[PDB]
């Protein structure tokens, strides 16, 4: 079963955690598969395999994106891997929602659920989130 111990994920940089409701899991999976799945299926990046979505890659990024708040901030303002340049014109985001029409109907809860799905997947599948075709 999906207990509460396995639904506990880190929210901010200090280290505080939270418990995701069972409905948030379903909403996050649905929204992720609908919006991200074309390019980020299985936790990999198709158009740039050097930057994945596995926890290790998220941890060695500059603004550090291994928690809910950093993921939401990235979705509101993307940057490069070193956090120096903005890439809002070549990546979907709220800032550039006038270019990508699929981001014009997203609320804060939607971003929270998507980030929760991304954070939750490694604890469930393990070494298959961002692993590739070998697994």
């Amino acid at each position: 079963d999906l207990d509460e111990a396995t639904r506990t994920v880190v929210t901010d940089s200090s280290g505080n955690t939270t418990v995701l409701t069972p409905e948030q899991v379903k909403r996050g999976k649905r929204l992720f598969n609908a919006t991200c799945g074309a390019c980020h299926t299985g936790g990999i990046t198709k158009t740039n395999p050097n930057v994945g979505l596995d926890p290790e890659a998220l941890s060695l990024a500059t603004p550090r994106r291994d928690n809910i708040s950093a993921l939401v901030d990235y979705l509101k303002n993307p940057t490069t891997y070193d956090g120096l340049e903005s890439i809002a014109e070549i990546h979907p985001s709220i800032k550039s929602a006038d270019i990508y029409p699929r981001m014009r109907s997203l609320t804060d809860e939607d971003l929270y659920s998507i980030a929760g799905h991304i954070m939750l997947q490694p604890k469930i599948v393990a070494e298959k989130w961002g692993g590739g075709k070998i697994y």
Partner: protein, 156 residues
């Protein structure tokens, strides 16, 4: 363990309803409104949508597009003088691909609509005369397009 009846959910109306795998839900398993029963997203203009419509960023982007498009349009007479038609056809579609979007987004009053229509017709004529290899008509159309875009930006 020893004995437990499995969970049941009949079409989402007789059973749990939210079991991570239901199908044929059409909503009714979340505390939110959707665009339609066949949709996953909500309404675009809703009160809690993070994206506005017509904020400062959009206007700045469109105006930058228009200014750089004017700068790009100022190159065609040289191409026509050198009889390089492929350059004429490529310049009107390389950077200026977003000019139609910017112009249609920034036009509200009827006179702006008329100016936009005239500018679009002028550039279409310029491209046609470039692909037909006629220098005089192409040069005249390029001058007309430059003048029309300058007028439209002035009217902003």
């Amino acid at each position: 363990a020893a004995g437990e009846s499995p969970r049941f959910s009949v079409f989402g109306v007789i059973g749990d309803g939210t079991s991570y795998s239901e199908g044929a839900a059409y909503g009714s398993d979340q505390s939110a409104e959707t665009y339609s029963p066949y949709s996953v997203y909500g309404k675009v203009g809703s009160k809690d949508a993070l994206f506005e419509a017509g904020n400062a960023g959009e206007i700045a982007r469109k105006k930058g597009y228009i200014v750089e498009s004017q700068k790009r349009l100022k190159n065609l007479p040289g191409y026509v003088e050198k009889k390089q038609w492929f350059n004429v056809k490529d310049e009107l579609t390389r950077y200026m691909y977003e000019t139609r979007g910017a112009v249609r987004g920034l036009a509200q009053t009827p006179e702006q609509k008329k100016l936009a229509k005239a500018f679009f017709q002028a550039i279409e004529e310029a491209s046609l005369q470039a692909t037909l290899k006629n220098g005089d008509k192409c040069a005249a159309a390029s001058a007309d397009s430059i003048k029309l875009l300058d007028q439209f930006y002035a009217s902003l």
